[PDB]
Write a protein that binds this ligand. Structure first.
Ligand SMILES: Nc1ncnc2c1ncn2[C@@H]1O[C@H](CN(CC[C@H](N)C(=O)O)CC2CN(CCC(c3ccccc3)c3ccccc3)C2)[C@@H](O)[C@H]1O
Ligand SMILES: [Zn+2]
Length: 149
């Protein structure tokens, strides 16, 4: 309804009251909603630093050697968002084969942002999930589960 830049300009405050991080039955911790989220709604930005894809291997190797969890979102074959040090709650979003959210790379005022949108109405208590771009067995539990990430 509202143009994309107008919708993006409001998020930090609204995501603080709309979502929370708790233990997930899918894997480790996940992002869950604290209030009902309308279909199409901008939920949260996957916050972090945009880096070149070639740099990920050494960055992940650095984090792993320090026993620090590595949180990255692959934009595509050339860019990645590193949420390890400068991330927010969106870094805990788990994968699902019947997701209720989807990721989009939006470019507002010359700057790229990965934003998460609701695919359907999401009800309080539900875990927020998106289909990861990509091996590892899937634990989403959906009827139509692809069984791998
Ligand atoms: N549908 C799914 N089915 C099966 N597995 C799934 C599904 N969706 C997501 N995952 C898993 O989550 C990963 C994505 N993840 C999403 C958030 C994650 N739930 C979390 O809690 O961090 C962010 C990455 C996980 N890492 C941190 C790990 C953390 C840890 C390890 C084991 C147990 C608990 C926690 C760790 C912490 C400190 C130091 C070292 C490691 C970043 C996928 O790569 C996959 O492994
Ligand atoms: Zn699945």
């Amino acid at each position: 309804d509202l143009p994309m830049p107008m919708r993006f300009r409001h998020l930090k405050k609204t995501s603080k009251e709309a979502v929370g991080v708790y233990r997930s039955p899918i894997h480790g911790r996940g992002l869950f909603c604290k209030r009902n989220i309308d279909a199409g709604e901008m939920v949260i930005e996957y916050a972090g630093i945009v880096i070149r894809s070639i740099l990920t291997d050494k960055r992940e190797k650095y984090y792993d050697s320090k026993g620090i969890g590595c949180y990255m979102f692959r934009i595509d074959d050339s860019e990645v968002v590193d949420a390890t040090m400068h991330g927010n709650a969106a870094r805990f979003i788990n994968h699902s084969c019947e997701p209720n959210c989807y990721s989009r790379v939006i470019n507002i005022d010359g700057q790229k942002h990965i934003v998460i949108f609701a695919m359907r109405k999401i009800y309080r208590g539900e875990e927020l999930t998106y289909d990861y771009k990509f091996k590892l067995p899937c634990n989403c539990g959906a009827k139509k589960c692809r069984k791998f990430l």
